[PDB]
């Protein structure tokens, strides 16, 4: 349904990118964006994107008022973790995937570490340092 700047993310990958990732909206809680669109570099025969998917993040903490519900970052990393685990058990494994997986799991471990630190201080879900 979508026809083909500052908003596009500058990615680590530079060559042969499948998609562009773009931040949607304005800065919100914490100074972060809470909507992104992943869109193909390819057109269909009449100029629509082959891929145009939106990701909406939980906007406004859980114990704070008026919060839009959505995805949280650890969910995305858990998906990527499951896919790399699968590729590693399959026919096209690689050292690079492994290194990436280990780093993804440690990123997830640090995100959980943040969750538990905020539980322990009784600030999880509030607009607090």
Which parts are annotated binding residues for 2'cADPR? 34, 58, 60, 62, 83, 87, 92, 97, 114, 118, 125, 127
Among 48, 62, 64, 121, interactor with a copy of itself by CB under 8 A = 62
What is the 8-class DSSP label of residue 31? G
Give the chain's end-to-end CA distance (angstroms, integer): 41
What is the rounded CA–CA span in Å between residue 47 and residue 79? Answer: 30
Q: What is the dihedral of CA 92, 96, 101, 102, to 10 degrees?
A: 140
Any contact of residue 19 with ligand OJC (CB under 6 A)? no
Closer by beta carbon to a copy of itself, 4 or else 21: 21
Which position among 4, 22, 28, 56 is part of the footprint of ligand OJC (CB under 6 A)?
28
Cβ-based neighbour number of residue 97 at 10 Å: 16
For binding to ligand OJC (CB under 6 A), which residues are involved?
A: 18, 28-30, 34, 57-62, 72-73, 84, 87, 92, 97, 114, 118, 124-127
């Amino acid at each position: 349904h979508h026809h083909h700047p500052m908003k596009e993310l500058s990615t680590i990958q530079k060559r042969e990118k499948l998609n562009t990732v773009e931040r949607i909206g304005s800065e919100g809680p914490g100074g972060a964006y809470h909507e992104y669109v992943i869109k193909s570099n390819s057109m269909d025969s009449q100029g629509n994107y082959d891929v145009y998917e939106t990701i909406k993040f939980q906007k406004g903490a859980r114990k704070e008022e008026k919060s839009q519900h959505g995805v949280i970052d650890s969910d995305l990393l858990e998906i990527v973790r499951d896919r790399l685990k699968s590729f590693q058990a399959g026919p096209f494994s690689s050292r690079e995937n492994a290194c990436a997986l280990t780093h993804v799991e440690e990123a997830l471990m640090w995100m959980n570490r943040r969750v538990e630190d905020r539980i322990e201080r009784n600030v999880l879900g509030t607009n607090t340092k």
